[PDB]
Amino acid sequence: DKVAVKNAIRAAYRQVFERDLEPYIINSEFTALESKLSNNEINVKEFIEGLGTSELYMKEFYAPYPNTKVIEMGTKHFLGRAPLNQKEIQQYNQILASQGLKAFIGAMVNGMEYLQTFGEDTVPYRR
């Protein structure tokens, strides 16, 4: 039950950030979400969205890389698969170009494929 959340918190940090985050990095932006997830006030999907919309995520996977890698990184993180094709990429690039990062992040986590593949209480994984 609590170990069940415990599993997810960790699970989702490695999925998104590819690493286990240090307590203080958590203390910076994830204190609320962990609690909500813990207190059963938000689901995994939501917590996974707190991640993509985190500032740490933009630093970690946007600040460095380019539009193509930014996008390549996101599909593998939130959809657990590479981009379907340049098309989806161009399709994705425009999201960014018009509403920014969060936009992009939301289009996947709030998408049908995501909802059908993972649901709301399942952490994305490489499919």
Contact 114, 68 (CB under 8 A): no
Q: 41: which residues sit within 8 A by CB, 6+ positions away?
A: 35
CATH architecture of 1-127: Orthogonal Bundle (1.10)
Give the span between the Cα atoms of 10 and 116, in whole angstroms: 23
Measured N-to-C along each axis, helices 44-52 and 2-17 cross at an angle, to the nearest 10 degrees, of 30
Contact 11, 123 (CB under 8 A): yes
- What resolution in angstroms, rounded to 1 decimal? 2.7
Going from N- to C-terminal start, the domains of the chain cover 1-127
Joined tokens for residue 97: 């170009």
Interior angle at CA 34, CA 24 and CA 81, nearest 5: 95
Contact 21, 13 (CB under 8 A): yes
Furthest-apart CA pair in the chain: how many Å? Answer: 42
Interior angle at CA 38, CA 14 and CA 81, nearest 5: 30
Contact 37, 8 (CB under 8 A): yes
Query: What sign results for the dihedral spanned by CA atoms 13, 111, 100, 32?
Result: negative
Give the span between the Cα atoms of 57 and 119, in whole angstroms: 22
Contact 126, 76 (CB under 8 A): yes
The separation between CA 3 and the C-alpha centre of its own chain, rounded to angstroms, equals 21
Give the span between the Cα atoms of 101 and 95, in whole angstroms: 8
